[PDB]
Each structure stands twice: as structure tokens, then as C-alpha cells.
Amino acid sequence: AEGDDPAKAAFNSLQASATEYIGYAWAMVVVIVGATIGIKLFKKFTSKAS
Amino acid sequence: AEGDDPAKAAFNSLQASATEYIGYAWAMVVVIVGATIGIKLFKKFTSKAS
Amino acid sequence: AEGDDPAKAAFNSLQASATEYIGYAWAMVVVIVGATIGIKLFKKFTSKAS
Amino acid sequence: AEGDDPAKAAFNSLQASATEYIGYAWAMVVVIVGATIGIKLFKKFTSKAS
Amino acid sequence: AEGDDPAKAAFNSLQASATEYIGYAWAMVVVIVGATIGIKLFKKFTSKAS
Amino acid sequence: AEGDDPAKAAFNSLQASATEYIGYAWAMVVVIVGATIGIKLFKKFTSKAS
Amino acid sequence: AEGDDPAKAAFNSLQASATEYIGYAWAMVVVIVGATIGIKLFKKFTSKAS
Amino acid sequence: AEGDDPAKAAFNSLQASATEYIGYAWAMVVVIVGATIGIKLFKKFTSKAS
Amino acid sequence: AEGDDPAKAAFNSLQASATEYIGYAWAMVVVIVGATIGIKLFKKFTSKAS
Amino acid sequence: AEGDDPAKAAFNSLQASATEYIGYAWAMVVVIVGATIGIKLFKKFTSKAS
Amino acid sequence: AEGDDPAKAAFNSLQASATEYIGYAWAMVVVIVGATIGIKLFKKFTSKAS
Amino acid sequence: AEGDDPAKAAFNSLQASATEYIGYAWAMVVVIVGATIGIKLFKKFTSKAS
Amino acid sequence: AEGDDPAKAAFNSLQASATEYIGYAWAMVVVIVGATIGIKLFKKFTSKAS
Amino acid sequence: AEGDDPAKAAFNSLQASATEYIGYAWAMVVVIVGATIGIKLFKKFTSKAS
Amino acid sequence: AEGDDPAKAAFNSLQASATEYIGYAWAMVVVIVGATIGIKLFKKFTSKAS
Amino acid sequence: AEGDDPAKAAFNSLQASATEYIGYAWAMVVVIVGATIGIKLFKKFTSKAS
Amino acid sequence: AEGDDPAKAAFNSLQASATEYIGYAWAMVVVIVGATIGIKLFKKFTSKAS
Amino acid sequence: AEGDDPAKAAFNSLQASATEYIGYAWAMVVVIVGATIGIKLFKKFTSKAS
Amino acid sequence: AEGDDPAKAAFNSLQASATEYIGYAWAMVVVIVGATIGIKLFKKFTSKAS
Amino acid sequence: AEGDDPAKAAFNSLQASATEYIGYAWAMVVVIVGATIGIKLFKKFTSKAS
Amino acid sequence: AEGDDPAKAAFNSLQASATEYIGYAWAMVVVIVGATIGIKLFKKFTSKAS
Amino acid sequence: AEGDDPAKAAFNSLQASATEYIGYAWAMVVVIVGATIGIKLFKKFTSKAS
Amino acid sequence: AEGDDPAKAAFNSLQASATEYIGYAWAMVVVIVGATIGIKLFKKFTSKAS
Amino acid sequence: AEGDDPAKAAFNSLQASATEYIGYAWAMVVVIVGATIGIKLFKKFTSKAS
Amino acid sequence: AEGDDPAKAAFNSLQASATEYIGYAWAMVVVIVGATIGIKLFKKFTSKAS
Amino acid sequence: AEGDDPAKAAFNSLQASATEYIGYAWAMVVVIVGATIGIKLFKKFTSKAS
Amino acid sequence: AEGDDPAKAAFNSLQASATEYIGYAWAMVVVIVGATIGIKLFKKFTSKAS
Amino acid sequence: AEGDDPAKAAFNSLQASATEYIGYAWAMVVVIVGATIGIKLFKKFTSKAS
Amino acid sequence: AEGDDPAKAAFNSLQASATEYIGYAWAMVVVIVGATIGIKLFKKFTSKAS
Amino acid sequence: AEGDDPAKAAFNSLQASATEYIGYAWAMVVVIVGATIGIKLFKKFTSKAS
Amino acid sequence: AEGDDPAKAAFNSLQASATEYIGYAWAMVVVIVGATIGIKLFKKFTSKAS
Amino acid sequence: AEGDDPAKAAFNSLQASATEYIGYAWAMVVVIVGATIGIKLFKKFTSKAS
Amino acid sequence: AEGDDPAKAAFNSLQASATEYIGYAWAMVVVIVGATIGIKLFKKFTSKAS
Amino acid sequence: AEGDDPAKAAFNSLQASATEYIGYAWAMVVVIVGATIGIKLFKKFTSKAS
Amino acid sequence: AEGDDPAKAAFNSLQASATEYIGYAWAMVVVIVGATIGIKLFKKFTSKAS
């Protein structure tokens, strides 16, 4: 019974896929923010150096 | 009489299946919202840090 | 009933995430203001020393 | 859990970047003030020598 | 008759769920605004202190 | 009703934060002006003593 | 209200500083004039003794 | 609550920085005036000796 | 008919909420401007006293 | 004749059910809009207070 | 209507603050000029006595 | 014929409802803009008074 | 038609608010200039009296 | 229109203040010259009496 | 109005100071001339006695 | 055909509304600039009078 | 033959009904757009007036 | 077209305001120079009379 | 055949309607931009005149 | 085609508006500089006449 | 092009104003020197006549 | 144009003031020389009578 | 095939429209900068002429 | 056999109809996008011209 | 490509404007210095002739 | 089998269409950014030249 | 399994694209800041050389 | 028995077809996202470069 | 792959545009400083020649 | 990592530029003071030779 | 690199201008002193010849 | 280049003015000494004739 | 912490520079006074030897 | 507080310096008068011995 | 470090210039006194020979 439901196999597969793509989502936005705010901070440097 | 109706057995089986898939529905959307809003909050960080 | 709602678990998780990122937001802006105004005060020194 | 949040990795990276650029900000303004006030003091010499 | 309608039981259940999630919505946005505007006010400090 | 609005709790919290940071703003600018004008007055001494 | 204004505390502090430096200004110029005119009067002696 | 506000930590840090740079401001202008007026007084000597 | 429309009850509720938050908006900005311009006027004092 | 038609009894029953569920529909959407726009107005506060 | 505008309350508050700081501005400059010109007049004495 | 169409009765009812909610829409946005721009104009005051 | 537009009522209200705050703007800057230039003229006195 | 301009009221006020301080300027310099030249004339007496 | 101007209080104070120092100027030069011409007259005696 | 299109009636109505609100936009900004620049010009007076 | 077909009578009846409901459709959407865009244009006013 | 532009009405209004304040600027500086140089010329008298 | 297809008649009718509403779209946005940018340019005037 | 684009009509209209407001910008600043520098030159007169 | 630049019109106007005030500067200093040196020459007479 | 320049009115006023004070300068020095040389001539008498 | 795609015809049409509006964008901003910086340079003249 | 199947005649007829309506679909959407994006590009102009 | 950039046309136009206004700047300051130093040299004459 | 599936022919056709429209998407946005940022850089010129 | 997910191939492709455009972002802003601050430093030269 | 069921042959055939079309679905959406987000990232470049 | 990215072509184009406008920025500010400081040095001449 | 940050390359470039312009600043002011004080010393010669 | 910096070209140009104006400064003061002291020496002749 | 510097034209003009006023200085002092010493020599006659 | 502040390093550097230039100031004025008063004393010799 | 003011330390230092230089002033003038009058008295001897 | 300070190079240059001009000062006054006292001694001859 338990574990024999194809729906559960599909669900778990989608859970794995979601987890992966969440890793992608965080990985991507971390790269985006890293560069974006990094440059912003460099812009703040030029302000502080004024 | 009561409990001897195949329709009731089918109904109860579908109720169990529904309950399970509701667990799946909540589990999935919790994962989705968790990551989605979590990143959104991180985006709010970058706003607040500006 | 109470505490068995996946939505509450998700909410509390987001509350924890928000709190963390608020710590990040304050930590960041404190660093920014610290340096920014610190240099500004040094600029005020050069004014006062004139 | 703790330390496994990509947001923290991004935050810490931005903290390092900020610290660096703060070093740049101070380094720059020290050079600017050094020369600026140094010459000013030389101008004060010419006043005192009058 | 009145109170025996499953639709009413469902409705009331959804009303309770909505009320809860409204509490979540306000709780969340209060936290967000609290930190967001709090930092903004700190930024206003640095302006006023200039 | 009155006092049960999360918005009011947030507002009052921001009012407290603002009041605090106003104290900071005045405290800071008083220190700045104190030293700035104090030295200016000392410069006025050197003028009057000429 | 009255007396609770940081601006008043700053003002009074500057008034005290000014008063002090006025004491310095008079003290200095009295010393300067004392010697300056004292010698001048001695020069007037040498004239009268001629 | 009290003392747990990052803004207060930043404020106090800036207060320390300001105090230091005020020490610098006074130290500098004292050196400037010392030499400036000292020479002026020497010039007054040459006047009195005339 | 008139007054029996849930939409009107909702509208009036939102009108009350808006009015309240308008009170908050004015209250907040009055506090902000009060301190901001108050300090500005104190800065104008230091200018006029120069 | 008139009133003896089972179809009319069914119709009237459905009319009552519809009316009830319309009450539910308005009740629900009023709650939704109340909170939704209420928070929106609070967001407008934070804008106006900026 | 008239007198119920927070802007008027803020304005009047700023008018009071301005008036006070004007008193400070005059008070300060009167002290400055008093001593400054007073010494100048004493310098004029030493001229007239020459 | 004309006026006996239930669709017309429904249409006219919806036209009345729309007209009402249009009154609500204008009433709301007038309140929003009133406060929003009113404060903005007060902000313009503080600019003009600078 | 004419005069029945909520937008006109809002506009006229904003026109009244603007006019008021213009009165505030002029009132404030007149006070500022009055004292500022008044003291300046007193400074011109001390120049003319030199 | 004419006479309703706050700028004119401010201007006229400054004109009155200027006129007053001009009276002060002349009054002061008349006193200064009176004594200064009066003594000078007495010095001319001692020359003529030689 | 009249008599409430700090500038007038300062002016009158300077007038008193000037008057005093004029007394000093005359007192001093009277002493100087007294002795100077007195001796000169004694020198005229020695001439007349020759 | 031509003129019988409800869309044209709606369009023309919106054109009239736009024209009106354009009148409002110009009327408002003229008032704003009038006062803003008027005061600015008064500030230019105080500069020219310095 | 022609015109004796009940289907044609039904068709023409449906054509009349459609035409009517098209009038309703345009009438409704004109009202909706009128208010919707009218307010939008008022929002554009507040933008242009900024 | 020509003359119907609110911008032109605003411009012309500002031109009138400027012209007025130019009259103020000249009027003020004429008064200032009149007294200032007038006294200077009186000082030149005392020089020429020496 | 060609031209006898009701679909073509409908298509061409929609093409005419689209063309008309495109005229409306351009007409509207031209009016919007005209006023919007026109005022913006007037704002640029006030900048250039500063 | 060419000349039938509403965008071109809008563009040309904005070009005309810009040209006009440029005339205003130059006209205004010429008036400002005229008076400003004119008075400055008069101040240079008083310097040259010293 | 050439001659159409408002800046040139302003420049030429300032050139005329300067030329005039130069005439004033020479006229004034000629009067000053005339009397000053004229009296000096009269003083030289009294020397030569001794 | 000619005669409408406040600078000319100021200039002419200063020319009148100068002329007056020149009259004073000559009047004074004539009195001084009159007595001074008159006594000198009397001293020459006593020489010639020796 | 190639060139028979309506999408390409639409694309090329949009490319032409974009190119035109780019010409407008540059044309406009050139006019804006021309006048803006031109006046700025005239302001630099008045600085250099000071 | 081949070509004698009514189904083929129907199919080919539907293929022709589809092809025609595809031409309509592309023609329509090209017109829609043309105007839609064309205006969008004009909006981009106003952005670039800002 | 080269020479087809509106930015270059604008740049060259500004270069021409700058060159012109530089001519104005030199022309003006030459006139100012000419008269200023010319009179100064005349003052040096009166010194040398003493 | 492989290659005989109409779905594959359709897929490949859509892949070609997508690739083309991607070329359009990049081509368009490159043109947009080119002009947009190009002008922005020209605006940066005017900043750097200030 | 791992590496066979088209989503991963797409993700990695986007990561490469992002990295490239980050290189562009830094490259661009480095060029901008280089020139911007470089000129600023040259402006600081002209200040220090004053 | 097993494998002799036409339904299984049909099922397996549909499984193969599905797998293929899944490959198409992923292939297509990867291309779509690739270009879509790729351009988005380029847009992020232009933001970061601002 | 490398060099086939439209984004790179756009980037390189913007790099060329930036480089050009940097040349403009330096060219302009060199002209400005040249004249500005050149005149300043001429002013220093008049000081040294005093 | 270290040395791979474009910000560091930009910083170091600005440090080199600053150092150069500091050399310019000192070089310039040395030339200015050299001549200025050199002439002053020559003026002191003429005093000592008197 | 070296020699390609517009700042260096500007610097060298200013160095040439300074050198020239230094030549002017010395040339002028030599002429001034020549005549001034030359006449002084002639005055010394008349003393020695007495 | 050489001879195109307005500063040179101004310098040469001042050189001519200086030369002229030197002629005046010598002319004047020659007249003064002529008469002064001439009379002195006549006084020497009366001594020699005694 | 202590000693790690770039501001302190800059301050100490400026203190060293000031001390050096004070040495220069005293060294210079000692040389000036040495020669100046030395010659004065030689002039006193010639007086005493008379 | 008292004694912690750098201004007092500077003042006291200047008081010490003044006292020293007063000692120098008296020491010098005593030497000067000693020799000067001593020789004068010797000259009186030669008179008395005649 | 030591010897690399442009200020030292300037100082030493001024020291050399001062030394030279001191040589000039002594050389000149020696010539003046030589002739002046030489003639005085010749006058003493004529006294002794009487």
C-alpha cells in the first residue's frame, strides 16, 4: 500500500526537481546580487572618496 | 447494511487518497513559497541595504 | 489542529528567514554608515582645522 | 541549516567586498586630505612668513 | 436545516483559515516595514547629522 | 478594534525608533557644532588678540 | 519643553566657551598693550629728558 | 530591546570617531595658532623694539 | 437595498483604515520635518552667528 | 396546479441555496479585500512617510 | 478644518524653533561684537593716547 | 417585449452597481491623492523654506 | 457635469493646500532672511564703524 | 497684488533695520572722530605753543 | 519693537565702552602733555634765565 | 456608422477628461514653480544685496 | 417557403437578442474604461504635478 | 496658441517678480554703499585734515 | 468564392476597428506625452534658470 | 508615410515647446546675471574708489 | 547665429555697465586725489614758507 | 536708460558727499594753518625784534 | 520562405520606427544639453569674470 | 480511387480555409504589435529624452 | 559613422560656445584689471609724488 | 519511423521560427540599449564636464 | 540522471551568460568611474593649486 | 499472454511518443528561457552599469 | 560562440561610445580649467604686482 | 581572487592618477609661492633699503 | 600612457601661462620699484644736500 | 599664440599707464623739489649774507 | 582598533608636515627680522653718531 | 572640564611666549636707550664744557 | 621622504632669494649711509673749521 502509489513516486520526483531548481534559483540570485551590490558598494566608494 | 456498501468502501478509499494528495499539495506549495518568498526577502535585504 | 497547518510552518520559516535578513540589512547599513559618516567626520576635521 | 543558506554566503561575500572598498575609501581620502591640507599648511607657512 | 449545510461548514472553515492568514499577512508586512522604515529613519539620521 | 490593528503597533514602533534617532541626530549635530564653533570662537580670539 | 532642547544646551555651551575666550582676548591684548605702551611711555621719557 | 539596536551601536561608534577627530581638530588648530600667533608676537617684539 | 451591500461595508471600512493611516502619514512626516528642519534652523543659527 | 410542481420546489430551494452562497461569496471577498487593501493602504502610509 | 492641519502644527512649531534660534543668533553675535569692537575701541584708545 | 427581458433587468442592476463602485473608486483615490500630494506639497514647503 | 468631477474637488483641495503651504514657505523664509540679513547689516555696522 | 508680497514686507523691514544701523554707524564714527581729532587738535596746540 | 533690538543693546554698550575709553584717552594724553610741556616750560625758564 | 461606435464616445470622453487634467497639471505646476522660483529669486536678492 | 421556416424566426430573434446584448457589452465596458482610465489620467495628473 | 501656454504666464510672472527683486537688490546696495562710502569719505576728511 | 467568405467580412471589419483604435491609441498617448514632457521641459527651464 | 506618424507631430510639438522654454531659460538667466554682475561691478567701483 | 546669442547681449550690457562704473571710479578717485594732494601741496607751501 | 541706473544715483550722492567733505577738509586745514603759521609769524616777529 | 514571414515585416517596421525615435531621442537631448550646458558655461563666464 | 474521396475534398477545403485564416491571424497580430510596440518605442523615446 | 553622432555635433557646439564665453571672460577681466590696476598705479603716483 | 513523425517536422519548424525571433529579440534590444545607454553616457559626459 | 536534465544545461548556460555580463558590468563601470573620478581629481588639483 | 495484448503495444507506443514530445517540450522551453533570461541578464548589465 | 553574442557587440559599441565621450569630457574640462585657472593666474599677477 | 577584482584595478588606477595630480598641485603652488614670496622679499628689500 | 593624459597637457599649459605671468609680475614690480625708489633716492639727495 | 593672449594686451596697457604715471611722478617731484630747494638756497643766501 | 584608523595616520602625517613648515616659518621670519632689524640698528648707529 | 580645554593650553602657551618676548622688547630698548642717551649725555658734556 | 617634499625645495629657494636680497639691502643702505654720513662729516669739518 504505502509507497506503492504512483502518485507518491511522481510527487517525490517533483520534490527532487523543485529542490534542484531552488538551488538554481538561489545560485542565480546570489550571483546577480553579488555583482549588483558589489558594484553598488564600489559606487559608494566613489561617493565616500568625494 | 451499513458498511456493506461497496460505494462506501470506494468513497473512503478516495477520501484517503484525497487526504494524501492534499498533504502533497501543501507540502509542494510550502516548498515553492518557502524558496520564492525567501529569495524575495533577500531581495528586500538588498533594498534595505541600499 | 493548531500547529498542524503547513501554512503556519511555512510562515514561521519565512519569519525566521526575514529576521535573519533583517540582521543582514542592519549589519550592512551599519557598516556603510560607519565608514561613510566616519570619513565625513574626518572631512569635518579638515574643515575645523582650517 | 545554519551556514547552508546561500543568502548568508552572499551576505558574507558582500561584507568582504564592502570592507575592501572601505579600505579604498579611507586610503583615497587620506591621500586627498594629505596633499590638500599639506599644501594648505604650506600656504599657512607663507602667511606666517609674511 | 440551518447549520446542516456542508457548504456552511466549509465556508466557516475557510473563514477561519483566511483570518489566520490575514494575521500572517499583517505580521509579515509589519516586520518588513518595521525593519525597512527603521533603517530609512536611520538614514534620515545620517542626513540630519550632516 | 482600537489598538488591535497591527498597523498601529508598527506605527508606534516606528515612532519610537524615529524619536530615538532624532535624539541621535541632535546629539550628533550638537557635538559637531560644539567643536566646530568652539574652534571658530578660538579663531575669533586670535583675531581679537591681534 | 523649555530646557529640553539640545540646541539650547549647545548654545549655552558655546556661550560659556565664548565668554572664556573673551577673557583670553582681553587678557592677551592687555598684556600686549601693557608692554607696548609701557615702552612707548619710556620712549616718551627719553624725549622729555632731551 | 535597549542596546540591541544596531543603530545605537553605529551611533556610539560614530560618537567615538567624532570625539577622536575633535581631538585632532583642536590639536591641529592649537599647533597652527601656537606657531602663527607666536611669530606674530615676535613681530610685535620687533615693533616694540623700534 | 441601500446599506445592505457588503461592498459598501467593505468600502467604509477601508475609508476608516485610510483615514487612520493618513493620520499616521501626517504624524510621521511632521515628526520627521520637525526634527529635520529644526536642526537645519540650528545650522542656520551657526551661520548667522558667524 | 400552481405551487404543485416539484420543479418549482426544487427551483425555490436552489434560489435559497444560491442566495446563501452569494452571502458567502460577498462575505469572503469583503474579508479578502479588507485585509488586502488595508495592507496596501499601510504600504501607502510608508510611501507618504518617505 | 482650520487648525486641524498637522502641517500647520508643524509649521508653528518650526516658527517657534526659528524664533528661539534667532534669539540665539542675535545673543551670540552681540557677545562677539561686544568683545570684538570693545577691544578695538581699546586699541583706538592706545592710538589716541599716542 | 421591451423591458420584459430579464437580461435587461440584470444589466441595469449591474449598471447601478458599477456606478456605485465608481463613486467608491473616485472617493477612495481622491482621499489617497489628497493626503499623498498634500504631504508632498508640505515637503515642497520644506524645500522652499531651505 | 461641470463641478461633479471628484477630480476637480481633489484638485481644488490641493490648490488650497498648496496656497496655504506657500504662505508658510514665504512666512518662513521671510523670518529666516529677516534675521539673517538683519545680523549681516549689524555686521556691516561694525565694519562701517571701523 | 502690490503690497501683498511677503518679499516686500521683508525688504521694507530690512530697509528699516539698515537705516537704524546706519544711524549707529554714523553715531559711532562721529564719537570716534570727535575724540580722536579733538585730541589731535590738542596735540596741535602743544605744537603751536612750542 | 523699539528697544527690543539686540543690536541696539549692543550699540549702546559699545557707546558706553567708547565713552569710557575716550575718558582714558584724554586722561592719558593730559598726563603726557602735562609733564612733557611742563618740562618744556622749565627748559624755557633756563633759556630766559640765560 | 461613423459616430455610432461606443468606443468613439468613450474615447472622446477620455480626451475631454485628459484635457481637463492637463489644465490641472499645468495649473498646479505653475503655482508650484511660481512660489518656488519666486522665493529663489528673493534668495538671489539677498545674495545680490550682500 | 422563404420566411415560413421557424428556424429563420428563431435565428432573427437571436440576432435581435445578440444585438441588444452587444449594446449592453459596449455600454458596460465604456462605463468601466471611462472610470478606470479617467482615474488613471488623474493619477497621471499627480505625476505631472510632481 | 501663443499666449495660451501656462508656462508663459508663469514665466512672465517670474520676470515681474525678478524685476521687482532687482529693484530691491539695487535699492539695498545703494543704501549700503551710500552709508559705507559716505563714512569712508568722512574718514578721508579726517586724513586730509591731518 | 473569394470575397464571399463571411470570415473575410468579419476580418476586414476588425481591421477597420483596429485601425480606428490605433488612431485613438496614438492620439491619446500623444496628448499624454505632449503635456507630460511639456511640463518636464518647463521643469528643465527652472533648472536652467537656477 | 513620412509626416503621417503621430509620434513625429508630438516630437515637433515638443521641439517647439523646448525652443520656447530655452528662450525663457536664457531670458531669465540674462536678467539674473545682468543685475547680479551689474551690482558686482558697482561693488568693484567702490573698491576702485577706495 | 552671430548676435543671436542672449549671452552676447548680456555680455555687451555688462561691458557698458562696467565702462560706466569705470568712469565713476576714475571720476571719484580724481576728486579724492585732487583735494587730498591739493591740501598736501598747501601743506608743502607752509613748509617752504618756514 | 540713462539716469535710470540706481548706481548713478548712488554715485552722484557720493559725489555730493565728497564735495561737502572736501569743503570740510579745506575749511579745517585753513583754520589749522591760519593759527599755526600766524603764531609762527609772531615768533618771527620776536626774532626780528631781537 | 525567407521574407514571406509577416513577423519579419513587422520586425523591420519596428526597426524603422525605433531608428526614427532614436533620432528623436538624440535630437531632443542634444537640444536640452545644448541649452543647459550653454547656460552653465555662461555661468562659468560670470565666475571667471569675478 | 485517389482523389475520389469526399473526405479529401473536405480536407483540402479546410486546409485552404485554415491557410486563409492564418493569414488573417498574422495580419491582425502584426497590426496589433506594430501599433503596440511602436507606441512603446515612443515611450522609450520620452525616457531617453529625460 | 564618424561625424554622424549627434553627441559630437552637440559637443562641438558646446566647444564653440565655451570658446566664445572664454573670450568674454578674458575681455571682461581685462577691462576690470585695466581700470583697477590703472587707478592703483595712479595711487602709486600720489605716493611717489609725496 | 524516425523523421516520419509530423510532430517532429512541426517541432523543427517552430525551432527555426523561435531562433529567428530570438535574433529579432536580441537585435531589437541591442538597438534599444545602444541608443538608451549611449545617451546616458552622453549625460555622464555633461556631468563629468561640470 | 544527473547532468541529463535540460534544466541544468539551461541553468549552466545562463550562469555563463551572467558571468560574461558581470564582466561587462564591471568593465563598464570601471571605465565610467575611471574617467569620472579622474576628472574629479583633476578638479581637486585646481582647488589645491588655488 | 503477457506482451500479446494490443493494448500494451499501444501503451508502449504512446510512452515512446510522450517521451519524444517531452524532449521537445524541454528543448523548446530551454531555448525560450535561454534567450528570455539571457536578454534579461543583459538588461541587468545596463542597470549595473548605471 | 565567442563573438556571436549580440550582447558583446552592443557592449563593445557602448565601450567605443564611452571612450569617445570620455575624450569629450576631458577635452571640455581642460578647456574650462585652462581659461578658469589662466585668468586666476592673471589675477595672481595683479596681486603680485601690488 | 585577490587582484582579480576590477574594483581594485580601478582603485589603483585612480591612486596613480591622484599621485600624478598631487605632483601637479605641489609643482603649481611651488611656482606660485616661489614668485609671489620672491617678489614679496624684494618688496622687503625696498623697505630695508629705506 | 605617459603624455596621453589631457590633464598633463592642461597642466603644462597652465605652467606656461604661470611662467609668463610671473615674467609680467616681476616686470611690473621692477618698473614700480625702479621709479618709486629712484625718486626716493632723489629725495635722499635733497636731504644730503641740506 | 604669442600676442594672442588678452593678458599680454592688458599687461602692455598697464605698462604704458605705469610709464605715463612715472612721468607724472617725476614731473611732480621735480617741481616740488625745484621750488622747495630753490627757496632753501635763497635761505642759504640770507645766511651767507649775514 | 587604536592605531588602525587611517584618519590617525593621516592626522599624524599632517602633524609632521605642520611641524616642518613651522620650522620653515620661524626660520624664514628669523632671517627676515635678523636683516631688517640689523639694518635698523645700523640706522640707529648713524643717529647716535650724529 | 576646567583645564581640559586645548584652547586654554594654547592660550597659556601664548602667554608664556608673549611674556618672554616682552622681556626681549624691554631688554632691547633698554640697550638702545642706554647707548643712545648715554652718548647724548656725553654730547651734553661737550656743551657744558664749552 | 626627507628632501622629497616640494615644500622644502620651495623653502630653500626662498631662503636663497632672501639671502640675495639681504645682500642687496645691506649693499644699498651702506651706499646710502656712506654718502649721507660722509657729507655730514664734511659738514662737521666746516663747523670745526669755523
Short mmCIF file of N, CA, C and O in Angstrom, two decimals, chain F residues 5 7-8 11 14-15 22 25-26 29 33 40, chain I residues 20-21 24 27-28 31 35 38-39 42 46 50:
data_model
loop_
_atom_site.label_atom_id
_atom_site.label_comp_id
_atom_site.label_asym_id
_atom_site.label_seq_id
_atom_site.Cartn_x
_atom_site.Cartn_y
_atom_site.Cartn_z
N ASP F 5 -5.11 46.86 15.70
CA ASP F 5 -4.58 46.97 14.34
C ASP F 5 -3.06 46.87 14.34
O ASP F 5 -2.37 47.72 14.90
N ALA F 7 -1.11 47.59 12.18
CA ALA F 7 -0.56 48.80 11.58
C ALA F 7 -0.25 49.85 12.64
O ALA F 7 0.74 50.57 12.53
N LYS F 8 -1.09 49.92 13.66
CA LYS F 8 -0.87 50.85 14.76
C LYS F 8 0.34 50.45 15.59
O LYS F 8 1.14 51.30 15.98
N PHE F 11 3.24 51.37 13.52
CA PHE F 11 3.37 52.82 13.53
C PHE F 11 4.04 53.30 14.81
O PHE F 11 5.00 54.07 14.78
N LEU F 14 7.63 52.53 14.97
CA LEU F 14 8.40 53.43 14.11
C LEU F 14 8.52 54.81 14.74
O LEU F 14 9.53 55.50 14.56
N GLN F 15 7.48 55.22 15.46
CA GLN F 15 7.50 56.49 16.18
C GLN F 15 8.57 56.48 17.27
O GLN F 15 9.27 57.47 17.47
N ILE F 22 16.10 60.74 16.28
CA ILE F 22 16.09 62.19 16.45
C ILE F 22 17.01 62.62 17.59
O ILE F 22 17.76 63.59 17.46
N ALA F 25 20.30 62.37 16.18
CA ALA F 25 20.55 63.44 15.23
C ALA F 25 20.95 64.73 15.94
O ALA F 25 21.92 65.39 15.56
N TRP F 26 20.21 65.07 16.99
CA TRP F 26 20.51 66.25 17.79
C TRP F 26 21.82 66.08 18.56
O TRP F 26 22.65 66.98 18.59
N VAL F 29 24.78 66.45 16.05
CA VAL F 29 24.98 67.79 15.49
C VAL F 29 25.38 68.78 16.57
O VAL F 29 26.07 69.76 16.29
N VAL F 33 28.65 70.90 16.10
CA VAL F 33 28.61 72.36 16.24
C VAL F 33 29.43 72.82 17.43
O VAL F 33 30.16 73.81 17.34
N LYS F 40 36.01 77.90 16.09
CA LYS F 40 35.75 79.18 15.43
C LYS F 40 35.89 80.34 16.40
O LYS F 40 36.48 81.37 16.08
N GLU I 20 -7.21 56.61 9.14
CA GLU I 20 -6.27 56.32 10.21
C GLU I 20 -4.83 56.42 9.74
O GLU I 20 -3.99 57.05 10.38
N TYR I 21 -4.54 55.79 8.60
CA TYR I 21 -3.18 55.69 8.10
C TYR I 21 -2.70 57.02 7.54
O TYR I 21 -1.51 57.30 7.50
N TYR I 24 -1.49 58.66 10.46
CA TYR I 24 -0.14 58.13 10.67
C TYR I 24 0.86 58.81 9.75
O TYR I 24 1.96 59.16 10.17
N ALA I 27 1.35 62.39 10.92
CA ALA I 27 2.03 62.32 12.21
C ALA I 27 3.52 62.02 12.03
O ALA I 27 4.36 62.64 12.68
N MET I 28 3.82 61.08 11.15
CA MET I 28 5.20 60.65 10.93
C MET I 28 6.02 61.76 10.28
O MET I 28 7.11 62.09 10.74
N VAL I 31 6.82 64.69 12.46
CA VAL I 31 7.95 64.36 13.33
C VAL I 31 9.26 64.46 12.57
O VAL I 31 10.25 65.00 13.07
N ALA I 35 12.10 67.58 13.33
CA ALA I 35 13.49 67.37 13.70
C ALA I 35 14.43 67.83 12.60
O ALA I 35 15.43 68.50 12.86
N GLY I 38 14.22 71.63 12.18
CA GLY I 38 14.66 72.16 13.46
C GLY I 38 16.18 72.20 13.55
O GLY I 38 16.76 73.22 13.94
N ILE I 39 16.83 71.10 13.19
CA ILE I 39 18.28 71.04 13.14
C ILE I 39 18.83 71.96 12.06
O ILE I 39 19.84 72.64 12.27
N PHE I 42 18.93 75.30 13.39
CA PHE I 42 20.08 75.38 14.28
C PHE I 42 21.37 75.56 13.50
O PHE I 42 22.27 76.28 13.94
N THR I 46 24.17 78.81 13.45
CA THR I 46 25.63 78.78 13.43
C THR I 46 26.18 79.60 12.27
O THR I 46 27.27 80.15 12.35
N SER I 50 28.15 83.44 12.65
CA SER I 50 29.49 83.50 12.07
C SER I 50 29.77 84.88 11.50
O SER I 50 30.69 85.53 11.93
#
